[PDB]
Amino acid sequence: HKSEVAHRFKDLGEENFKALVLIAFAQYLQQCPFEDHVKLVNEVTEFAKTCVADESAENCDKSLHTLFGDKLCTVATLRETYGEMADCCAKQEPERNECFLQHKDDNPNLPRLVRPEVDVMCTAFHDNEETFLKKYLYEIARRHPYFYAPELLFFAKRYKAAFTECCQAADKAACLLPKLDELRDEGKASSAKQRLKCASLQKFGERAFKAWAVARLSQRFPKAEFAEVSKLVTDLTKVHTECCHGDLLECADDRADLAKYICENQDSISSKLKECCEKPLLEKSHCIAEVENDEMPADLPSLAADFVESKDVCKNYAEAKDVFLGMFLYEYARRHPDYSVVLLLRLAKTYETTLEKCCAAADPHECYAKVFDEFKPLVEEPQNLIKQNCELFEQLGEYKFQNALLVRYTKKVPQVSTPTLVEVSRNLGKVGSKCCKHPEAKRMPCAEDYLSVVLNQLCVLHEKTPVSDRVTKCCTESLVNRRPCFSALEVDETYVPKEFNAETFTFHADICTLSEKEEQIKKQTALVELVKHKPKATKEQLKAVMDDFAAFVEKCCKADDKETCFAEEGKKLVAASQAALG
Ligand SMILES: [Y+3]
Numbered sequence: 001h002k003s004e005v006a007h008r009f010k011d012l013g014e015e016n017f018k019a020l021v022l023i024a025f026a027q028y029l030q031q032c033p034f035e036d037h038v039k040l041v042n043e044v045t046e047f048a049k050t051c052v053a054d055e056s057a058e059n060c061d062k063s064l065h066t067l068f069g070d071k072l073c074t075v076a077t078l079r080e081t082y083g084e085m086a087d088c089c090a091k092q093e094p095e096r097n098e099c100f101l102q103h104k105d106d107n108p109n110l111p112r113l114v115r116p117e118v119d120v121m122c123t124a125f126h127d128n129e130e131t132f133l134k135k136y137l138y139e140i141a142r143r144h145p146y147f148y149a150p151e152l153l154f155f156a157k158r159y160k161a162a163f164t165e166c167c168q169a170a171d172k173a174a175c176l177l178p179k180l181d182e183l184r185d186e187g188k189a190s191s192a193k194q195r196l197k198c199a200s201l202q203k204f205g206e207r208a209f210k211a212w213a214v215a216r217l218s219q220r221f222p223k224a225e226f227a228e229v230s231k232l233v234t235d236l237t238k239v240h241t242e243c244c245h246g247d248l249l250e251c252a253d254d255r256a257d258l259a260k261y262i263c264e265n266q267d268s269i270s271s272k273l274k275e276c277c278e279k280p281l282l283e284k285s286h287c288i289a290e291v292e293n294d295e296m297p298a299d300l301p302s303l304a305a306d307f308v309e310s311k312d313v314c315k316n317y318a319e320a321k322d323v324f325l326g327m328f329l330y331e332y333a334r335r336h337p338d339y340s341v342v343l344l345l346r347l348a349k350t351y352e353t354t355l356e357k358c359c360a361a362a363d364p365h366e367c368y369a370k371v372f373d374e375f376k377p378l379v380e381e382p383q384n385l386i387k388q389n390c391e392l393f394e395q396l397g398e399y400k401f402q403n404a405l406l407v408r409y410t411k412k413v414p415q416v417s418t419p420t421l422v423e424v425s426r427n428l429g430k431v432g433s434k435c436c437k438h439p440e441a442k443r444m445p446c447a448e449d450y451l452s453v454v455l456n457q458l459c460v461l462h463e464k465t466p467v468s469d470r471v472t473k474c475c476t477e478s479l480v481n482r483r484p485c486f487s488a489l490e491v492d493e494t495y496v497p498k499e500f501n502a503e504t505f506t507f508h509a510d511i512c513t514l515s516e517k518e519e520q521i522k523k524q525t526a527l528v529e530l531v532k533h534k535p536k537a538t539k540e541q542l543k544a545v546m547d548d549f550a551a552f553v554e555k556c557c558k559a560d561d562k563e564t565c566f567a568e569e570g571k572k573l574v575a576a577s578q579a580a581l582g
């Protein structure tokens with residue numbers, strides 16, 4: 001209509017409109033208290049009601065960017081609080097929005113999240129459900145300025161459901177706390193993925209993202225014609241570029257436009273969009289993004305015919321290299337949803353390389369004949385790693401598998417800080433228990449998802465604390481070969497053992513009153529420091545000390561005087577270990 005505010009309000013819903021407006025303003029004004037934002041939201045809401053009533057009231061036909069900016073400049077203490085952001089309020093559209101976007105340093109140290117007792121929150125929730133979820137969004141929004149506001153709304157919907165059920169049950173802490181921790185982990189995991197996707201765009205460029213998207217969309221929509229997948233990738237690239245740039249308004253519009261188009265052509269894209277295209281406008285974008293892979297046509301031509309066996313390959317390559325390479329990805333990706341996107345890019349990379357030499361050669365059809373024998377090792381490598389690692393995950397527990405990784409990676413890079421080694425290994429153990437549950441046809445894509453974000457946190461951690469040139473090489477190299485680089489890491493033979501530190505290997509009765517997580521991390525920290533001090537001790541000898549130490553703790557914890565038991569007999573264990581490890 002004449003006004004956009006009216007449409008959006010009516011196209012979305014008052015309560016959802018009031019939420020997005022709250023997040024939108026909270027992401028910029030990361031200082032102004034909660035009560036201030038509520039006033040900002042109400043003023044905007046009432047204004048939108050005026051726009052809903054009169055389709056041409058005072059400043060009602062203005063664009064969202066314009067209207068948003070005007071209200072953002074209305075704040076009194078703007079240059080007196082945020083600093084350079086106020087110079088943007090002296091500009092005009094569309095440069096003013098571009099300004100605001102620039103001055104958005106997403107690292108303003110804020111008071112750490114203060115989680116009270118389980119009953120005070122439940123009481124506050126019940127008294128005012130609406131405002132309890134409003135304060136949730138505010139506190140999160142200002143802490144994650146680049147977090148996609150709609151995605152934060154699905155995190156608030158789960159937050160309500162958790163509190164709605166767990167505040168009614170007998171043991172509220174044995175329902176809520178675990179559910180709250182899971183969300184907090186899911187939230188940081190979602191955040192990390194967005195910032196990784198964006199960092200990759202600002203490193204390898206649009207063409208690189210396009211290649212990633214083709215491979216992924218072809219896996220999800222293995223029926224959709226190539227011309228359709230290309231058009232979806234072209235829209236996804238523009239959507240991803242405006243979201244990484246920091247424009248929530250254009251990001252949310254382009255996502256809505258794409259969600260609408262996908263839902264209007266589902267018969268020509270996928271049959272698995274039936275229930276996603278049932279939902280409201282805002283949930284369409286989210287549902288479609290996590291949509292299950294469609295079944296692949298059984299009557300598919302052999303992909304080796306049009307790319308190797310054919311004698312028009314070089315001729316069909318010359319016409320449009322990227323189009324032809326895109327078709328190769330499309331055909332390979334849709335035939336192999338059990339492959340990681342990263343593996344398919346290794347194959348797509350290899351094929352390009354081989355066509356860039358063999359097509360300029362004397363006899364091409366002779367040169368690139370055996371190109372599919374070059375993929376076999378590229379495919380077998382990850383498959384062999386998964387099968388070998390998932391087998392070992394069955395043999396031991398989850399915690400016992402983490403101990404195996406602890407030893408494995410400490411021996412490889414013993415210079416890395418214990419906490420980084422513990423955090424990485426524990427996370428990597430949880431990948432095993434969340435992927436090995438599936439069969440071979442789901443494991444690799446499952447692994448890729450989790451490994452991508454686990455390997456990036458390590459790379460970010462190591463960049464703040466540079467320690468190994470090898471780890472720097474792995475983090476700075478091609479994103480495709482990131483995981484292979486870490487896999488290829490050899491045991492450090494140069495490394496000289498850390499000297500024995502009594503403080504490091506002294507435990508008390510205090511450990512008995514630690515949660516399973518706390519206890520495990522204390523024990524796993526001690527294991528890393530054992531390998532850093534005995535890096536050439538065998539899996540045999542480590543297992544011996546670990547078990548001797550495991551039996552040691554589960555022998556005085558809940559025993560007649562546990563304070564002396566863990567000090568007196570604890571010293572004997574150290575001495576008993578110091579006899580077998582020189
Ligand atoms: Y209530």
Ligand SMILES: [Y+3]
Nearest residue numbers: 242245247250
């Ligand atoms: Y734009």
